[PDB]
Structure 1
Amino acid sequence: MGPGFDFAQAIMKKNTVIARTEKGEFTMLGVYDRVAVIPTHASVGEIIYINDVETRVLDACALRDLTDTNLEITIVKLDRNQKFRDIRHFLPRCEDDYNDAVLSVHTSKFPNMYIPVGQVTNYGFLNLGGTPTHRILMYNFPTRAGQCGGVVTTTGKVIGIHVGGNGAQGFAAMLLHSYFTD
Structure 2
Amino acid sequence: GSGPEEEFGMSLIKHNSCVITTENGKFTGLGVYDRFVVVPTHADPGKEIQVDGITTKVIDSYDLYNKNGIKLEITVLKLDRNEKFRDIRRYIPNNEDDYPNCNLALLANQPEPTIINVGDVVSYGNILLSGNQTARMLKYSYPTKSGYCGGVLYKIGQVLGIHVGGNGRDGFSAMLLRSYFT
- Using structure 1 for the length normalisation, give the TM-score: 0.97
Q: Which residue of 2 aligns with 1:51?
A: 52
Q: Distance in 2 between matches of 1:110 and 1:88?
A: 28
Q: How do residues 96-135 of structure 1 correspond to structure 2 at under 5 angstroms? A: 96-135=97-136
Contact residue 20 and residue 48 of structure 1 kept, 8 A: yes
Q: Which residue of 1 aligns with 2:164?
A: 163
Query: Secondary structure of 1:58's partner?
Result: strand
Deviation at 1:108, TM superposition (A): 4.5
Deviations 1:72-124 (A, max 9, x none): 00000000111100000000000000011000110253421110011001111
Contact residue 105 and residue 112 of structure 1 kept, 8 A: yes
Q: How do residues 13-162 of structure 1 correspond to structure 2 at under 5 angstroms? A: 13-162=14-163
Aligned residues: 181
Q: Distance in 2 between matches of 1:133 and 1:107?
A: 23
- Tell me the percent identity: 48
Question: RMSD between aligned alpha carbons?
Answer: 0.8
What letter is aligned with 1:65? N
Contact residue 106 and residue 152 of structure 2 kept, 8 A: yes
List gaps (5 residues or longer) in structure 2: none
Q: Which residue of 2 aligns with 1:178?
A: 179
Query: Secondary structure of 1:134's partner?
Result: strand
Contact residue 4 and residue 100 of structure 1 kept, 8 A: no
Contact residue 127 and residue 134 of structure 2 kept, 8 A: yes
- Using structure 2 for the length normalisation, give the TM-score: 0.97
Contact residue 110 and residue 146 of structure 1 kept, 8 A: no
Q: Distance in 1 between matches of 2:33 and 2:110?
A: 26
Deviation at 1:154, TM superposition (A): 0.8
List gaps (5 residues or longer) in structure 1: none
Query: Secondary structure of 1:146's partner?
Result: helix
